[PDB]
Design an enzyme around this catalytic site. Structure first.
Site, PDB file in Angstrom:
ATOM      1  N   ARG A 260      30.455 -41.619 -75.316  1.00 47.20           N
ATOM      2  CA  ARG A 260      31.897 -41.732 -75.560  1.00 47.20           C
ATOM      3  C   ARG A 260      32.180 -41.740 -77.065  1.00 47.20           C
ATOM      4  NH1 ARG A 260      32.886 -46.937 -72.184  1.00 47.20           N
ATOM      5  NH2 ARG A 260      30.895 -47.257 -73.245  1.00 47.20           N
TER       6      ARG A 260
ATOM      7  N   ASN B  16      34.107 -44.057 -69.277  1.00 42.18           N
ATOM      8  CA  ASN B  16      33.028 -44.134 -68.322  1.00 42.18           C
ATOM      9  C   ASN B  16      33.572 -44.398 -66.908  1.00 42.18           C
ATOM     10  OD1 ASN B  16      30.208 -45.767 -70.123  1.00 42.18           O
ATOM     11  ND2 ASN B  16      30.975 -43.675 -70.077  1.00 42.18           N
TER      12      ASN B  16
HETATM   13 CL   LIG Z   1      27.111 -43.242 -73.369  1.00 42.24          CL
END
Ligand SMILES: [Cl-]
EC number: 3.6.1.7
Length: 90
Positions: free
Chosen positions: A19, A37
Site C-alpha cells: 500500500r 487491504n
Molecule cells: Cl503490503
C-alpha cells in the site's frame, strides 16, 4: 484527460509494503485515491488522475515493491468524479 481507476491486486501483496508503495508512486504522479487491504488478501486501489498518470501507476502496481509477488491485476477505468484530495492507505 482525467479518469478514475478501480484495481484489484492479487498475489503476495499484503505484509510486503504494497500500500505504501502504491501511495508513494501515486503521490509522485499527482494521483488521488486510496490503497486498501481487503479480507481476501488482495489490495484494492481507487485512483483518480490523468490517463497517462494512471497508466504509469498501473505499471507500478503490476510489479509491487521487491518483497511483493503480484500474480494478477484486475482493473477498470470509469469516469472521473473529483472525489479525493489526497492518496491514503487503509
Ligand atoms: Cl503490503
Amino acid at each position: 484527460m482525467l479518469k478514475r481507476m478501480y484495481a484489484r491486486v492479487y498475489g503476495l501483496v499484503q505484509g510486503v509494503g504494497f500500500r505504501k508503495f502504491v501511495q508513494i508512486h501515486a503521490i509522485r504522479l499527482g494521483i488521488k485515491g486510496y490503497a486498501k487491504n481487503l479480507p481476501d488478501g488482495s489490495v484494492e486501489v481507487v485512483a483518480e488522475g490523468y490517463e497517462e498518470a494512471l497508466s504509469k501507476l498501473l505499471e507500478r502496481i503490476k510489479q509491487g515493491p521487491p518483497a511483493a509477488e503480484v500474480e494478477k491485476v484486475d482493473y477498470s477505468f470509469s469516469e472521473y468524479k473529483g472525489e479525493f484530495e489526497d492518496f491514503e492507505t487503509y
